Structures are given as structure tokens and as C-alpha cells.
Design a protein around this ligand. Structure first.
Ligand SMILES: Nc1ccn([C@@H]2O[C@H](COP(=O)(O)OP(=O)(O)OP(=O)(O)O)[C@@H](O)[C@H]2O)c(=O)n1
Ligand SMILES: Nc1ccn([C@@H]2O[C@H](COP(=O)(O)OP(=O)(O)OP(=O)(O)O)[C@@H](O)[C@H]2O)c(=O)n1
Ligand code: NA
Ligand SMILES: [Zn+2]
Ligand SMILES: [Zn+2]
Lengths: 144, 310, 144, 310, 310, 310
């Protein structure tokens, strides 16, 4: 059913919805959440869908979806009306979620949150570790 | 006597194609029909100056499977060479007056060859000498490849990992290059490419070889996927991470592999071969290790037993 | 909103629906999945609900829910109707998902799957590691 | 075949009362009439990843007393697991292709059980795994108790020392708790008391047990005074000193002991048993150690020799 | 001629209520108004025979803040470990002819006291001696408690962790017991309970104390939650795991703490204090360590200057 | 309020052309006219978790030349190595409550940056962090280049050795790339070539660079010949030997060098710079290290004093 007021992430590629629920621990709320995985669609055949009642994401919390759901669509839906939709744009920093490939990086053994600088390079995205200063292709950082 | 009787086994370079065939043929017979007392009354020295679990344990097990006794050590810490700085020569000069053959692994290249000049008429078998030779490893590898593919010629063989420093891959390439029609695929990080002197050796013999940046890129036609461990410590932590995924193997990568293709690895492994490959029908690295017994056994029989007796 | 054929796990206590999806990799299929978190139950206030079309569970797969969702109810649905329905029975063993609390246990560093023997007793379940043979309270094993 | 043929010997928990009797009966026959060639042509691995003098030496001596050969190591320092961080699994996966049985002691609980899942059809015998099991120790203890008392039921047994962490006492208690009428006396410092899970186990079986703060307090009725070393390092230097005298044994304490009572100790000892006890007729800890041969020998024969042959 | 002039700072037992107050009062004055040239021309030995991060670094830093110089060592690579003997006695007898005061940490109980009998008139300050005393740690804990609570009387103080072996919790209890109406809450594993002699001491003085299962139990009424680590080594890895949860603090647990409640820990910590506590207003362990500077400065001034005109 | 006041000195990437010049300018003034009481009353931590001769000794010496005190360590025998955990985070959180600034060298990349998030307002200066940064080494190299060449623009700079892994050559190239018209000459073994990202960085800025076989090739046109060691460990003992001759400098090779050409080396060296070069006017490595004193003094002054009135 269509939610009242809250946010709804639409057009998530298949197998990314759950990943999103995990990486950003979005299910750690007392709010009614409805999730649809492997639902039929047109612009991508099959997609995932997340609905979180009475919750909203800053335009930065949305950009953080870029590396996982670049062609996704966030909706602000309020009072049963699609208030303001928004597309995920590449942020300039991604924290907490990523893991540094450099095994000798201090981030691994210490109680610190991970953090990378984002930079688009055509074909891939370069991620530079705040501690490291080493830069890796998002294909290496994500593809673990 | 047989062509290897009382001969030293030091370098793959000193073993003719007939010699390799002879060892394998012998390794097959003993494997089929054991000779528990073939080397009764023989005492062999097992001298390891460098760590080892498979090469030393299989060799010693082989000696016993044939009825021979064993004396030796796993490290040089508690030997005169080690405490009162005795020379390797004197060590051999002396040990050679005790045993009927010497199996040794040493951290320095040439060690086994050096033993040879001080062991009198006592055969020495190279269990590994620095970054130079490791012949018994190649013998079991060959046996293993022939046992699973039925031949040693006209094969498609891929070798992955530290090709620049790996002595077992350098040796296996030379060995296979003694047979005909073999074509090689070398998959290694740019920093760890197969050395030029090997590439030239393959050219002089008009043997086809090519470079590839990923395992998945050659999967479809290899008969032997010979994996070795990418010596990570030989690379910059971050350098490694960027090219890593191209040199590690997992079960999913075997989707388009040939039915007869086997994955080998001299071991020990670390990361390069995921455990989910273990139960696939392609996994043959433990069978390979088990084949060390036969071969190591065939080698000892040929060297210590006069006339043939296959 | 009532799948043709599949399984429905009802009466999942709050904050357990995600765990179940995680621990048992329920979202690792192509089959259409429907999820409900913090939904109104009627008395227990809210409860999680999971639906998995064209997918059914053995009584052992269901029993594996005992520790997390004891009061849960697994519903078998074929041709729009809830043919059979069962409740999780305490399992004999629990493999893969639990982690042995003994730091000196061989299971940690080696490539083997966890495994504990289940034995109900004095007000709680005791889990015994197949390996170190140390027995712990389901509370301490589940605690991490 | 016999009930233990090709079975793994990992936990006292997996050995039935009949199994223990079977081992002891076999240990008695071999002790009486040796079988020097019973295991001829067998090669057994002796792998110790932790220090040991009696468990490893007796086991290896047993192998030879039966005609079997041996390969192995006393520490993991010079093995691939040790130098190139190979997994225990791979280590076993490989060694199991060489030998007919594996005897191993490892610092981590579960090790032997883990070997079991990677040894194929090769029997593994737990020579000690962390603070979990040490079955062969219990087998020789039982043999020893039955040999000196003539039975394993209706016995008065006292155990002293580190009862909280001692695996041999935990195992012996379980084992004896498989027989009938046994009553236990636990003498240990408050900080090192026998664990509750053991006390409950004894209750469910309606077995009588009681706590006592001194050895002298139970001397008069014990048939077996099982001594273990009070792991001093497990206590505050001064804490120990205050309760020490209650957990050490000397010749004078044996004034009112029963004629048939024997003092046992798995060894090594340190302080707990003064040497003036050595020459008393009650001292049986070295005879106990000597009994390790038979038993360790019986165990190997049952596991490796098909049909019985007592 | 202040009370602590040229006095040894060895045991908390040697310090009176007045003594403690004199030190804390001075620590406050020096904090508010430093005297960087106070100990100019003075040279102080910093001898640590055991590891340390905060005790040595703060003491030495305190010496510099007062303008004094420093000589010493972090371990033994001197005449004591190198050239045998060189008893602690002779080591002190010699060093005391060089420096104006000796700060020492040693693994044996009584070391600092011993130094005292060979140091002539050179004051020695005990920075920790085995499982006995650690007076400067107590002085900084008190200053930290008095600073955040404005008093050392009528306090609700809970102590968590290894109360059996922790020398600092013992010393702090002793210390606070020199003040009135304080109430203690001991929360520890059964195996590491606050020792009975501490409890007698409290009874003897009519001071209230009680044992509790978890922190959550006493939370709502503590002014000072004194945490210490529970080294797993002092317990069975299994045993530990079963009671861990009730001796480790995390942010949420502070949900019902008094506004004034401050969490203290002598450090270092492992996991008994989750990092999510660091951000709470209650976290006061780093401030506590920062106070070591003032408490220790105060001590050096009182001991090295007969009349502090501040 | 100078640009670098209370600022962290972590990465060469965090330093601007102005920043670099400000530091070098101050280094010149302080060299000509010392200010020995400038940092009086300040106490600075010197924490080295990795070996060092020049970086630690000069930094600490620089602190004294400015009148500041020092506390720290040369390795771990503190709470971090001794009593486990004691994370680097908690180590800094504590030390930062003692000192006015932290100088640290650590084996992991990112360590210094991490210290920054737990040091409060205490400035941390990176004396080397794994294979990442080493900013004070670059600052002294620049001061040394600017001093002998009178500029940092339009220079012919050749870098020799391990350009692939050397963190100091990477940092210096980055640094000089912040100036105009400089020309680089990279001379290295094929296996240790300057990394591609450095080359992209140069292209992106329109800076000229080229690869050369030997020093002899570019000699006649370099203003600064920056040498570094080529650790044989990063190559095959054999491989090395074949290209050695072209990466080692000897007196004669300087036969056609410009009068102004200065030979630099961050040190230590092994053989890449023959001792017969020491006597030539070109040898400037010891002077270079001597400048670490002024560059580092400058840094401490700029960071610890808001307004240097010099
Ligand atoms: N009260 C509402 C209103 C809208 N939605 C959901 O929010 C999204 C709104 O999409 P819509 O406005 O209908 O535009 P579409 O035609 O679906 O195209 P697009 O995916 O670009 O939005 C859809 O997931 C819709 O189901 C909802 O859950 N509850
Ligand atoms: N095609 C169907 C059929 C049933 N259900 C779900 O199956 C669960 C149980 O439905 P049912 O047994 O028919 O009624 P209940 O009263 O919910 O049964 P119980 O009280 O045992 O939960 C509910 O979540 C219902 O939505 C569904 O999602 N799709
Ligand atoms: Na033998
Ligand atoms: Zn990093
Ligand atoms: Zn376990």
C-alpha cells in the first residue's frame, strides 16, 4: 500500500536494497517500514523498494546512495502526495560504510570511522582514504 | 644400473626428459604395488635448514614406506653449524660418513651443489636451495599433471602469482619445456612477471607463451591452472589490493573451465585459492601433495637401488 | 498484497526481522520478497513480517528461528491460501550463524562453520560448541 | 571389526564404558604378551604444537614397540603453519595424505576435532587440546587405578590442586563417573574449586562427592590420592602461601593411609609432592607414567588393527 | 617545614587525611598558578623497571613543568640486567649520589621501600611496586574525585572489575576510608571479589559496603563509578565470557546516572569501557589522567621544598 | 596569528607554497639569530614507534635549542605494547593532556592523522607514517635546496634509487611541483620506477620529467642530485647486481657536474654513495641533515607561537 507521510526509495537495482538496509542500518528504527525486493519494473526489469514512514533524508544522506543506487529516486511523500523527488548525486566524502584496502592503514586496528574523498574519473570513481591518503578505484573498495 | 643410480638430484636443469619419465614410471609402479622393504638397511639423513611441512614430511614418510631409517633435524639451531659456526662443507663431510643418502633444504642457492663436492659417494637430493632449484617438487608436479591429463605434451598450462621469484614455477616451466607442444599462459602482477631468461628459453625452443592480467581471461582453455601464492610482502600493501582480485581463485571463476582441468598449487596457500574451491572436482592440490610420497619414493629407489626393478 | 505461493513468517518480534534476513540470507534469491517492520500486530503492538514467494522451509529451517522468534508462525501459502502453518520447534543443533564466546576456540582462526548442540534446561537454552566443547548460556552466545 | 577400529579418539565424552574397558583389557594383554610387529608397515605422525615429554615420548615409543614408523615435530616453529601461516586444516589435509594415523597436541581447544574434519579416513588421536580434552591421559590413569585397586567401581577417590582448570582431573572425573559406586573428595583452593558443571554432572547421576580444605582431612579413606600441581601462577603469590600447606603432600602425611591407597599424578610435578614420598609404597606416579606405554599401545592397536586380536 | 618535606612516598598506609589534603590543596594551587622555576637546579631520577605510559610520562612531565631535569630509564639495559648482580640496593646507593629524588616502578612488592634504606636523604617516590602500593595513582584519583565532587566525604563510590588483584582499587578504598560517611559498591566476578581484609577494614571503621551483580543495579546512586580492567588471563576464556556483560560499561547504561556522576578508570582499558562512553559528559578518565600532572607536581614540590610560599 | 599557528603538520598535501616559504623563511631567521628561550615552559612529546637516528635526535635537539623540555620513547615498553590494547587513540588522548605538542613516527599509514582526532588542541607533527608522509624531511630538503641554489623555481632535479617505494622522494616531487619551471630526471631500476600517479600529477601541471638509464646521462645538467637507497631486499640479489652500477654514485662520476650541483641523500645510506664523494664540494648530505635542526625549529616555533617577533 502507498504510505502516508515519510520517505520512499524507489528504483534500487536488485540485490542492493538489503545492502542499503545494512550499510546504513535503516531498520534500527521504531517506524513502520515496508520493503519490496525483486519487484517488477520497466527501466531495469527488477528493482528493490524501501519505504520508511515519518522519516526523511538530508540531501547528503541521499548522495550517499550514489555508489549503490545511482539511478534511484528518493521521494518525500507527505499526506499521500509525492512532495519532492530527488536523484542521488555523487558526494565528495563517504564515511563509515567503506573499508580501506590498504591493510597497513591505521583505520583497521583503531576505533575510528572510515572515510574517503570522492572523485569521478570516467569509468570509475577514485576514493582517497583520509588516514591513508592512498587512492583506490571504487571497484576495489566496494568489490571485496 | 638404472640411469639415476647413485646420481645427485640437484637441478631440474640436469634431468633429461627420459629421467623425468623414468621417475614418473617408477612412481606409478610403486604407487600401484608397494615395496616396503626395498630400502631396508639404509639410513638416510633428512637435513632441513629452512622450514618445511610437506617436503620434509613426505620425504621422511617415503623413506619409511621403503624400509629405510632416518636421522636429521628441522632447523640448524642445535647443530655445530648453528652454535659453533661449523661450515656446511664440514657438516656434510661428516654426515656423509654416517648415511647412505642426504636430503637437504637450505636457505642459500647452491647449497645442495656444494654438499655434492663434500659427500664422497653419498647421494644428495635438493629439497630446496634458496631461489634456485626444487626438483622433487617438479617431479611430483609432473607426475600429478600426467596422472590427471594422461600426458605431458600438447598441454595448455597457466601459472599464476609470483612468477618473478617463484622457483617452483621456474622449474616446472623448464621441465615442461622438455616435452613437446606445450603452450603457457603467465598470469602475474606487472611487478612479479615471469623473468625474461625464462621467456627466451621458451623462444629458442619455439614454445608458445603469452601474458594475461587475469585468471578468468584464460580459464576456458587451460588444462592445468597452476596456482602459487602472490607473495604479498613483495608488494606495496596498496599496490597489491588494486590487482589482487585478478590473481585469486574462487569457485565461481570455474564456471567455464574444461572438464579435465585441474587446479594445482605447490602449497602452502594463503589467500589465492578460496576454500570454496576445495570440494569442486577441479581441486587437485591435496592430491598433488599426496603424490609427493610416490615420486619422492621413486626418486629414492632409483638413486639407492642399483639395477632397475620397476 | 497476498502472494500467490510462498512462505510467510508472521509474529516476528520487533528488531528480529532484519536479523533473520541477515543471519539466514533470506534476501539472496530472485524470488519476490515482501517485508514489514514494526507493523501493528493487535496486542504486541508491533512485529516484523516476512513474505517469500515460490519458497518454502523445512521444519529444520523453521526450527532455526526458535532462538530469535519463538512465538513466530511460519505460514505455507499455495494458490493464495494458507494451506499449512507451523511454529518453530527448538533445534537439535545450530550451525553457521552463532559465534563461540571462547576466544581460544579453534573455530575462530580456521575455515570451519560454527556448530552448537542445543539443550533446554533451567530457564534457558544451553549451547555447546562442537569444537572446544565449552557450554554457554544462549544469552552469552547471542550477545555477540 | 573391533569397536574402535578407525575411530577418532578426541573426547572422553565420546568413549563408552565398554570402550574404556576394551582399551584397558587390550593394554593388559599387550603388557603381558607383546606384539612387536602388529603395526609393521604403518607410518604414524606425531605432531606436537605444544610442549610435552611424557605424552609425546610414550606415544612414539608405543608406535615403535608395535613396529610402526614415525614422522612429525615437537613445535610448529619450522612448519609452513608457523612460518608462512598455513591453516591447521590445510596442514592436516596434507599430512593425512602421508600417514596412517595422526597423534596431535595443540594449544587451542577443538584442534583435534577440527583435524577430524580434514583427515579423510585417517584416525586422529587427541594428545591434548587446550583446556578441553586429554583422553589418552585418562586411559592410562584408569588402567593404573584398576591395576592397583583391582576394579573401577565403588572406589574412594580424592583429587587435589587446580581442579578449576585441570583438564585431566575434569576428564578423569567424567570417566570414573561412567562406572558405579564411586565417591569423590575434591581438595582445592577456594579460587581453584572443581567447576559447577562437573558437580551437576555428578548429581544427575546420583554420585556422592564432597569438598575438603586439606589432604590430611581425607587421607584415612581414599583408595586413590590423585595429585595435580596447584598452578601457583594462577594465584596471588601471597594468596598461595597461606593455603599452600593444605595442598602439598609429604611422607609424614601418609601415616594413616590405607594399605592399598596409591598416590597418582599425571606429571610433571613441581612442589605438591615432596620427593620423600618417592620411596614409599604408595608412590605410583612413575608406574602410572610407565603405564602410558601400554594403553597408548592398546589404543593404537585398536584403531589401526581391524579385527580384534587381544 | 611542611609535613611531607624530604619524606618518602611509599605506601598509602603512610599517608594521613591531613597528608592527603595537603597534597590535593597544593595540587589545586599549582594548577591555578604554576611555578615553572620551583625545582630549578634539581635533577630527578625516573627509574622504571616495568612498563608504563601514564605514570612515567606524567611524572617526568611534572618534573619539567617545575623546571627540574630528568635522568633514568624505561627498562633494564643498565648494570642490573646486563652485568648481573648490581643489586637494586647498590643501584640505588649509586643513583642517590646523583639525583635529588628517585621515582621508581618495580615488579617486586617492597622495592620502593627497599630503595628507601639505601638512598640516604634522597626521597624515593613509589610509582608502583608489584601488587602492593601505587600511591601517586591514588593521590590523582582523590584529587579528581574531590575536584568533580567537591569533597571526599559522604560519597557513593562503586568499584568495578578485578577487585581481588587490583592494587589501585585497594589503595583507593583504603584512602577513602580515611574520610567520613563514604559508601562503597563492589561489583565483580565471583572469582575476583574484593578481598576479605579490605572488607574487615571497612567493618572496623563502620563504613558501609555491599556486593552487587551488575552496574545497572547501583547506577542511579553513584557519584563515582571507578572502572578497572578485568584481565581475561585471570579467568577461563569461557568463564569470562559468561559474566563479561555485567562488568563492561557502554553509553546507554548511563541513561539514569546522576548529573554529577563521573566515570573513572586508572587506565589502560581494553573493552570494559566502550568508546561510545567517551563522548558522554560522564566520561572523566582522560581528565583523571591529566590530573596526574598536578597531583604529581604537588608531590614533588612538597617533598623537595621545605616551605611552599604559594 | 601566523598561518601555521596551532596547526597539525601531517601531510605535504596540507602545505601550500606560502606555507612552505613561511617555514623556510623562519628557518633562516632562527638559524642566523637563535631564540633559546622561545619555547621555554613548553613540554613536547617525542614518540617514536619505529627506529630513527636523525629525525628523532634532531627534532628533540630542536626542542632544546628553543628551550623546551622533552618526554617520550624510542620504542614500545609502555602501555600499548606491554599491556595489550591501549590503542593509539587512548595513548594520544592521554599524552595530549601532558604535552604542548606531539611529534610521532609510526609504522602504519595514517597514524599521525589519527592522533590528530584525539589530541584535542595539542598539535601533532608527523615524523613519518608508514609509506605515506614524512613532511619534516621534505621541509628540510627544500630549505637545503633553497639555501644552496637560492631558489625553488626553475631547477634541474634528478632523483635516484627506489622511486617506487620511497616516501620522501614522492613528497619532495609533490613539494617542488608547487613551484614553477622545475625539471625532473627519474633514474631507477625498472622494478622500482617512480609511480604513475606522480607522473600524472606532473603532466597535469605541465611540469617536465623524463626517465634515464644512468646518472652519467643527466649529470652535466642537474642542480640537485637527490640520492636514496635501493634496498636489495626489494629485488632479487641477482637482479640487483645487474643494475647496481647505474644507481650508485662515486667521486669520478662528478667529473662534469655544475659548480653549484649539490648531492643530497635523506640518509641513511649503505653503498649508493661511495665515501670518496664525502670529500668533494658536491657532497651535501650531512649539511642537509644539519638543516633538519633549523627546519624543525622553525616548525615548532610557527606552531607553538602565534606571533613570531623575529
Ligand atoms: N502515498 C504514496 C504516494 C506515492 N508512493 C510511492 O512513491 C513513488 C511515487 O512515484 P510516482 O509519483 O507514482 O511516479 P512514477 O510514475 O511511479 O515514476 P517514478 O518512479 O519516477 O516516481 C512510488 O513508489 C509510489 O508507489 C507511496 O508509496 N505512497
Ligand atoms: N496469499 C496470502 C495469504 C496469507 N498471507 C498472510 O499469512 C499470514 C497469516 O494469515 P491467516 O493464517 O490466513 O490469518 P491469521 O489470523 O493472521 O492467522 P494467524 O492468527 O495464525 O496469524 C498473514 O500475514 C497474511 O497476511 C499473505 O500474505 N498472502
Ligand atoms: Na623406524
Ligand atoms: Zn587507509
Ligand atoms: Zn568453541
Amino acid at each position: 500500500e502507498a504510505i502516508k507521510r515519510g520517505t520512499v526509495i524507489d528504483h534500487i537495482p536488485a540485490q542492493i536494497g538489503f545492502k542499503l538496509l545494512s550499510l546504513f542500518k535503516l531498520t534500527e528504527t521504531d517506524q513502520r517500514i515496508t520493503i519490496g525486493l525483486n519487484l517488477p519494473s520497466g527501466e531495469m526489469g527488477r528493482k528493490d523498494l524501501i519505504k520508511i514512514e515519518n522519516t526523511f533524508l538530508s540531501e547528503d544522506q541521499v548522495d550517499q546512495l550514489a555508489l549503490y543506487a545511482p539511478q534511484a529516486t528518493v521521494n518525500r511523500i507527505d499526506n499521500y502526495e509525492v512532495v519532492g523527488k530527488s536523484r542521488p548525486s555523487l558526494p565528495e566524502r563517504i564515511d563509515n560504510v567503506l573499508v580501506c584496502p590498504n591493510s597497513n592503514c591505521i583505520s583497521h586496528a583503531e576505533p575510528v570511522s572510515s572515510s574517503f574523498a570522492v572523485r569521478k574519473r570516467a569509468n570509475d570513481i577514485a576514493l582517497k582514504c583520509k588516514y591513508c591518503e592512498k587512492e583506490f578505484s571504487h571497484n576495489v573498495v566496494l568489490a571485496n | 644400473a638404472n640411469p639415476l643410480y647413485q646420481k645427485h638430484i640437484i637441478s631440474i636443469n640436469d634431468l633429461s626428459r627420459d629421467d623425468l619419465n623414468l621417475v614418473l614410471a617408477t612412481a606409478a609402479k610403486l604407487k600401484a604395488n608397494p615395496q616396503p622393504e626395498l630400502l631396508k638397511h639404509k639410513v638416510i639423513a633428512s637435513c632441513f635448514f629452512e622450514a618445511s611441512t610437506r617436503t620434509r614430511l613426505s620425504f621422511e614418510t617415503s623413506m619409511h614406506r621403503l624400509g629405510a631409517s632416518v636421522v636429521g633435524f628441522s632447523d640448524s639451531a642445535n647443530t655445530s653449524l648453528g652454535k659453533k659456526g661449523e661450515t656446511l662443507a664440514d657438516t656434510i663431510s661428516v654426515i656423509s660418513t654416517y648415511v647412505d643418502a642426504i636430503v637437504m633444504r637450505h636457505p642459500q642457492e647452491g647449497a645442495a651443489r656444494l654438499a655434492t663436492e663434500f659427500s664422497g659417494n653419498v647421494p644428495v637430493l635438493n629439497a630446496g636451495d634458496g631461489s634456485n632449484q626444487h626438483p622433487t617438487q617438479t617431479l611430483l608436479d609432473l607426475f600429478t599433471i600426467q596422472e590427471t591429463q594422461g600426458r605431458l605434451d600438447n598441454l595448455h598450462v597457466a601459472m599464476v602469482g609470483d612468477l618473478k621469484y617463484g622457483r617452483t614455477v621456474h622449474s616446472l616451466t623448464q621441465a615442461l619445456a622438455k616435452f613437446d607442444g606445450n603452450r603457457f599462459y603467465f598470469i602475474a602482477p606487472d611487478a612479479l612477471a615471469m623473468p625474461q631468461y625464462i621467456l627466451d628459453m621458451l623462444d629458442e625452443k619455439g614454445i608458445a607463451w603469452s601474458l594475461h592480467s587475469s585468471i578468468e581471461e584464460v580459464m576456458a582453455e587451460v588444462d592445468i591452472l597452476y596456482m602459487t601464492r602472490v607473495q604479498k610482502e613483495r608488494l606495496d600493501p596498496s599496490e597489491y589490493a588494486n590487482v589482487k582480485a585478478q590473481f585469486v581463485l574462487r569457485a565461481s571463476d570455474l564456471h567455464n573451465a574444461k572438464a579435465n582441468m585441474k587446479v594445482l598449487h605447490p602449497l602452502p596457500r594463503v589467500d589465492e585459492i578460496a576454500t570454496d574451491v576445495d570440494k569442486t572436482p577441479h581441486a587437485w592440490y591435496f592430491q598433488q601433495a599426496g603424490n609427493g610420497i610416490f615420486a619422492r619414493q621413486a626418486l629414492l629407489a632409483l638413486v639407492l637401488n642399483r639395477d632397475l626393478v620397476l
